[PDB]
Design a protein around this motif. Structure first.
Motif, PDB file in Angstrom:
ATOM      1  N   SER A 368       0.827  -1.203   0.000  1.00 58.72           N
ATOM      2  CA  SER A 368       0.000   0.000   0.000  1.00 58.72           C
ATOM      3  C   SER A 368       0.871   1.267   0.000  1.00 58.72           C
ATOM      4  O   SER A 368       2.065   1.215   0.288  1.00 58.72           O
ATOM      5  CB  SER A 368      -0.945   0.034   1.198  1.00 58.72           C
ATOM      6  N   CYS A 369       0.244   2.399  -0.321  1.00 55.60           N
ATOM      7  CA  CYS A 369       0.905   3.701  -0.482  1.00 55.60           C
ATOM      8  C   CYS A 369       1.578   4.192   0.809  1.00 55.60           C
ATOM      9  O   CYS A 369       0.926   4.401   1.826  1.00 55.60           O
ATOM     10  CB  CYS A 369      -0.128   4.735  -0.949  1.00 55.60           C
ATOM     11  N   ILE A 370       2.883   4.392   0.753  1.00 49.27           N
ATOM     12  CA  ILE A 370       3.610   4.784   1.945  1.00 49.27           C
ATOM     13  C   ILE A 370       3.208   6.217   2.275  1.00 49.27           C
ATOM     14  O   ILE A 370       3.340   6.651   3.417  1.00 49.27           O
ATOM     15  CB  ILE A 370       5.133   4.723   1.734  1.00 49.27           C
ATOM     16  N   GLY A 371       2.700   6.926   1.267  1.00 50.37           N
ATOM     17  CA  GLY A 371       2.399   8.337   1.416  1.00 50.37           C
ATOM     18  C   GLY A 371       0.943   8.615   1.705  1.00 50.37           C
ATOM     19  O   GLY A 371       0.511   9.762   1.672  1.00 50.37           O
ATOM     20  N   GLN A 372       0.174   7.586   2.014  1.00 57.98           N
ATOM     21  CA  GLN A 372      -1.246   7.817   2.224  1.00 57.98           C
ATOM     22  C   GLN A 372      -1.570   8.994   3.174  1.00 57.98           C
ATOM     23  O   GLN A 372      -2.290   9.931   2.781  1.00 57.98           O
ATOM     24  CB  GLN A 372      -1.983   6.539   2.635  1.00 57.98           C
ATOM     25  N   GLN A 373      -1.064   8.957   4.412  1.00 56.69           N
ATOM     26  CA  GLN A 373      -1.428  10.005   5.382  1.00 56.69           C
ATOM     27  C   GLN A 373      -0.864  11.356   4.921  1.00 56.69           C
ATOM     28  O   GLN A 373      -1.514  12.377   5.067  1.00 56.69           O
ATOM     29  CB  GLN A 373      -0.973   9.722   6.839  1.00 56.69           C
ATOM     30  N   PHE A 374       0.344  11.346   4.373  1.00 53.22           N
ATOM     31  CA  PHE A 374       0.929  12.548   3.801  1.00 53.22           C
ATOM     32  C   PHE A 374      -0.050  13.225   2.805  1.00 53.22           C
ATOM     33  O   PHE A 374      -0.331  14.435   2.897  1.00 53.22           O
ATOM     34  CB  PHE A 374       2.251  12.163   3.131  1.00 53.22           C
ATOM     35  N   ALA A 375      -0.580  12.433   1.879  1.00 51.66           N
ATOM     36  CA  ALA A 375      -1.472  12.937   0.837  1.00 51.66           C
ATOM     37  C   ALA A 375      -2.798  13.360   1.416  1.00 51.66           C
ATOM     38  O   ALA A 375      -3.384  14.359   1.001  1.00 51.66           O
ATOM     39  CB  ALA A 375      -1.687  11.883  -0.256  1.00 51.66           C
ATOM     40  N   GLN A 376      -3.306  12.580   2.358  1.00 46.97           N
ATOM     41  CA  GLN A 376      -4.561  12.976   2.986  1.00 46.97           C
ATOM     42  C   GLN A 376      -4.437  14.290   3.772  1.00 46.97           C
ATOM     43  O   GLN A 376      -5.331  15.121   3.724  1.00 46.97           O
ATOM     44  CB  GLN A 376      -5.155  11.857   3.807  1.00 46.97           C
TER      45      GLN A 376
END
Ligand code: HEM
Length: 422
Positions: A368-376
């Motif tokens: 899964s996207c390591i940057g999920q929370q970053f992007a959110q």
């Protein structure tokens, strides 16, 4: 777009269907139980066959064995394990200054054009913002694309993107030029970084920090360029597209907008900067962004290698087969979502059962996207600030709709006129 063809074959020919994507054959798998099985287990890994066209492009290597390109589980887990650190709660929280700065700069630029007649490509604006955020938060650099700067770098990315498209569908080697330019930008920033850290200077904890840290003992810095171009692209393009969609869609949802305005007025009032603590409170915005990813996920899915011939929803699938998973496809099946074409944020309201393996705009499991929370986080800050200050009406002749480039994005750039809210 091709994804819509897969949708139709999924509705018509069932949960397991053989198709041609990027000129290889694979099997698209559209049952939630299969999603769960294959994505939630370390046993299943990316299919290097699908990802090689991204590893290198027209002779010039692009993403190489970066954090996305790399398919081998063990070589991957080494990178991931250290790069994870740049994404811990403390790291993200320290990003709020970057997100705030850039979003405010965007809103200011836009207010300057907000006379109700000047048209603006929100697609371009959202892209420059995403790139500025990423460049500073990840590599500690100012690009200033919001202010007319780094136009060449902007063009490289643009062409480098069209390139990737062609590289993997074509039934003008500015492209190779671009891929090289990008890689050199990387050499320069990685350099400016070392040169400051050998002035024993105090540089804080970046993504860049961790990528270097992970390329230690490397004879070349070639894997370090891999990761550079990887985050440089992964870290702004899908966010910009996500933004562009949300704004495209909102322009024809006056009720939704009213409720969003209402919400942001309460949570933040008219303060200029959001605190990390405010994000959590933007409940309804958060629902809107979810419903946006359901209908318009910039990244439509992922591939996994099935190596042992297995049975999938009562269908024997031969070993050594690329399995295709599509959140775009599932998002639009009436079997999983009632009245699918309807944009409805309440689907994600408090108390609604969370979608169960039928929604994965950030993918699932270990890849899964390591940057999920970053992007959110980034995406809430920008949207909040737009909602706080501006109203967007879309210019006549702008089509709602979608195109399948390197990722999905709006068919037309998103041309709008703007008025100050009021
Ligand atoms: C709203 C925006 C974003 C969406 C929808 C998104 C989506 C996902 C998806 C679907 C993948 C692909 C999984 C695969 O190919 O199998 C991916 C992977 C990843 N994303 Fe994102 N992403 C977003 C933003 C970000 C951001 C902001 C960054 C960077 C700071 C980033 C970095 C990456 C990386 C490095 C990976 C590979 C992770 C690994 O395999 O260990 N993404 N993301």
């Amino acid at each position: 777009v091709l994804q819509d063809v897969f949708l139709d074959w999924a509705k018509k020919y069932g949960p397991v269907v053989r198709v041609n994507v990027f000129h290889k054959t694979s099997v698209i798998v559209t049952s939630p139980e299969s999603v769960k099985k294959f994505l939630m287990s370390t046993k299943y890994n990316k299919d290097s066959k699908m990802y090689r066209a991204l590893q290198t492009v027209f002779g010039e290597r692009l993403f190489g064995q970066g954090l996305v390109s790399e398919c081998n589980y063990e070589r991957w887990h080494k990178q991931r394990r250290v790069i994870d650190l740049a994404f811990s709660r403390s790291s993200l929280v320290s990003l709020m200054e970057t997100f705030n700065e850039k979003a405010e700069q965007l809103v200011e630029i836009l207010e300057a054009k907000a006379d109700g007649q000047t048209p603006v490509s929100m697609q371009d604006m959202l892209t420059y913002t995403a790139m500025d955020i990423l460049a500073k938060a990840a590599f500690g650099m100012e690009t200033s694309m919001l202010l007319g700067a780094q136009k060449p770098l902007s063009q490289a990315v643009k062409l480098m993107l069209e390139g990737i498209t062609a590289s993997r569908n074509t039934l003008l080697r500015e492209v190779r030029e671009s891929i090289r330019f990008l890689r050199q930008v990387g050499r320069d920033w990685v350099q400016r970084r070392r040169e400051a850290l050998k002035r024993g200077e105090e540089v804080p904890a970046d993504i860049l920090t961790q990528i270097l840290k992970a390329e230690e003992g490397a004879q070349d810095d070639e894997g370090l360029l891999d990761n550079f171009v990887t985050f440089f692209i992964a870290g702004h393009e899908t966010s910009a597209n996500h933004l562009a969609f949300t704004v495209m869609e909102l322009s024809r949802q006056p009720e939704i907008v009213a409720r969003l305005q209402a919400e942001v007025d309460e949570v933040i009032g008219s303060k200029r900067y959001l605190d990390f603590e405010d994000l959590g409170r933007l409940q309804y915005l958060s629902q809107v962004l979810k419903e946006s990813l359901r209908l318009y996920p910039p990244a439509w899915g992922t591939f996994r290698l099935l190596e042992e011939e297995t049975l999938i929803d009562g269908v024997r699938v031969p070993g050594n087969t690329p399995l295709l998973f599509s959140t775009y496809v599932m998002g639009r099946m009436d079997t999983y979502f009632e009245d699918p074409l309807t944009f409805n944020p309440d689907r994600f309201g408090p108390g609604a059962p969370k979608p169960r393996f039928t929604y994965f705009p950030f993918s699932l499991g270990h890849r899964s996207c390591i940057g999920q929370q970053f992007a959110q986080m980034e995406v809430k800050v920008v949207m909040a600030k737009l909602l706080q200050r501006l109203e967007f009406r879309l210019v006549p002749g702008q089509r709602f709709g979608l195109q399948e480039q390197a990722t999905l994005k709006p068919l037309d750039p998103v041309l709008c006129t703007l008025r100050p809210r009021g």
